[PDB]
């Protein structure tokens, strides 16, 4: 399920916004050229970066536990 | 379950490694990225990306 | 009437704030170490940078006009 | 009488010349420092400082 640069940038950008990192969000939106990203912001849920990251951890725990 | 500081360091490292100098600078401060208790040594390059990769594999396992 | 680095930094910082340059103000406050400046913000009037700059221009106009 | 864009370019140039990289970057955007109609050539280094210097001489002439 290959992930693109623009995707992670969107997840990060939205994380900065939601966490109240107003100044970082602004700076990152520009540096990452987020305006030029082809992603629909309205279809991205809140805490998305937090959610995937949480699942990423659990997935790795599952890989170790079966071979544990 | 991950914590705010852990997530913050992940995005912070990503920002540095991705060459987002000005974002890295501003976010280091706004986060108070230290003052927090994380050892940079135990977090490898692309860790944010890597954990996200495993997270999409998990989501692809839930719709299956 | 010698002017110091911290002084001009304060004038600029306050200009960014007042003009609504929220993100610049934040970034500059940090870069210029404005927290470490020995200046009393409460005794600095609004549009101070704009005012001095305006007077700076008028002063130069006066220097040219008498020799004009 | 000076204009918003003129003041903005002055502070912008000052930010660059003073090595405030991250401020210069953020302020270039937030200002929309161009999109505005100023020729960099006709504005010398330290122009912000210089005009401020003359402004304090003027204020010192008013209390006198």
């Amino acid at each position: 399920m290959s992930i693109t640069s623009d995707e992670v940038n969107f997840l990060v950008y939205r994380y900065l916004q939601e966490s109240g990192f107003s100044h970082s969000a602004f700076t990152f939106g520009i540096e990452s050229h987020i305006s030029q990203s082809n992603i629909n912001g309205t279809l991205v849920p809140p805490a998305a970066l937090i959610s995937i990251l949480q699942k990423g951890l659990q997935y790795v725990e599952a890989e170790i536990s079966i071979n544990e």
Side-chain angles (χ1 to χ4, degrees), chain A residues 2-62:
Chain A
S2 274
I3 189 159
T4 73
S5 264
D6 288 349
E7 286 172 316
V8 23
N9 283 355
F10 206 93
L11 260 21
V12 164
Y13 176 67
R14 276 281 297 269
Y15 169 75
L16 305 181
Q17 277 181 331
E18 288 162 16
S19 305
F21 299 122
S22 179
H23 305 297
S24 298
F26 178 83
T27 307
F28 185 65
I30 304 306
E31 270 195 318
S32 68
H33 303 299
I34 213 71
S35 66
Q36 224 82 174
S37 98
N38 224 25
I39 297 145
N40 203 316
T42 53
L43 287 184
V44 176
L49 182 87
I50 310 162
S51 297
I52 303 158
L53 236 49
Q54 184 61 232
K55 290 180 167 185
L57 260 48
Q58 282 158 30
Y59 194 101
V60 175
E61 277 151 347

